[PDB]
Assembly symmetry: C2
Homo-oligomer: 124 residues x 2
Amino acid sequence: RLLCFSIYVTKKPDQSEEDHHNHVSKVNAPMMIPFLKKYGIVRYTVKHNDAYSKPKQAALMAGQPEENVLAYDTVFEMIVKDIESIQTMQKDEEFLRTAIPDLFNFADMTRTKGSGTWIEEFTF
Amino acid sequence: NRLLCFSIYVTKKPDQSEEDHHNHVSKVNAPMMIPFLKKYGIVRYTVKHNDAYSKPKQAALMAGQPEENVLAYDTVFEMIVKDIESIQTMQKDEEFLRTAIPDLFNFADMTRTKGSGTWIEEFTF
């Protein structure tokens, strides 16, 4: 059974949505990727809710009341075989001085939410 | 060329056991869904379970977080597609309307479903 760690990010207050998502894709992702590789993350997914995706979300959610649109600026998902992979990553000396301070440059750190699940996956 | 993701956040049917909910989802709903997902070109389908098996792992990951920060639904479905017309056509397929749609009422609280639509980046190692 594979597990999934989901991180639901509200963008830094005052930060443009364009600045937020550019930082996430162009700076945070290449910062993250070496740690994810080193600690055996199977899959990493970054989900963006911005001007580009919003009309598609509005079409998919047509006929739903707005409070049914569970919308965060960015959602990260890490799929792993064991949560110890993630906990060891997060305490990695280098992680604490790179990925952790970078959070304050794109996330409202008073509002983050998360979940841990077991998953089934299908590809075609 | 950006992939899109449709996320469906499901609260279990009132009075349904966690065990019954997740067995129905994995064993009945998934094989019901898989042919439609294939036919309509969904790239990836992910079913995320929050039950007795995952809960101590989530408690460990979320250690030190206030309970209201644990955004927890019973089941989360994610469909990754090249464009949303794939999904909308699937959902209006007459066979979908008499199989997948009624099956929702046998495992989901249909007054409480939430969703989102996002564009995604994906990495494998």
